[PDB]
Amino acid sequence: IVNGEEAVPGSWPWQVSLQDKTGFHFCGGSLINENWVVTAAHCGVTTSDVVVAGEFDQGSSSEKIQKLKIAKVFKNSKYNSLTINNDITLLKLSTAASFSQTVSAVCLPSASDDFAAGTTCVTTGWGLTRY
Amino acid sequence: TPDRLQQASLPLLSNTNCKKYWGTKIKDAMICAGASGVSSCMGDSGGPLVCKKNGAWTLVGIVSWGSSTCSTSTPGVYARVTALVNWVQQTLAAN
């Protein structure tokens, strides 16, 4: 995020970090409950990857993070890698997330729910801040 | 990439208007937001696009693709969750 601001630590409890075994942050995700994480299909998540919950400062050693194992990867089969259309993948955790003050779920909308153009929303993450 | 979590507000746009930047790359299951002085960038993919509705935050978009430069004047492309939620609800109920 280019032009963002630092979040209040623990204010986006559903935000997770996808790391590979090297410990490198490669994609973000959102917790929808204690056993399921939603991300992008294009992220190419594998079961050797790990989901980190409740983290704020990725260079901190005193944070009580939760590193969760990935049991299974469900890429929507309507996902089109040519167009990147339907870019959603669910991840089934092996180990339930422990919901705390800093670890919670986002709500899913209704297929019918309406988000009007012009509405102001928020996005978060640990993506580049400059290019 | 920054080590602390970052946030940004950004307005949602219509697909129509979005096609002015992107054109045909925009699909029915895509939703644009941004072009407001901020932008999602590399490493933000898979993360949240939330909107407060009835007091709670709800996932409306998933960080997908955009400008190769993360230009803050081009709209970002996010997966439209409203068009994919029937799949998530089916996937959770099966497994």
Partner: peptide, 10 residues
């Protein structure tokens, strides 16, 4: 869902 314990400060 959607109601964090630590209110986001925008």
């Amino acid at each position: 869902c959607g109601v964090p314990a630590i209110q986001p400060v925008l």
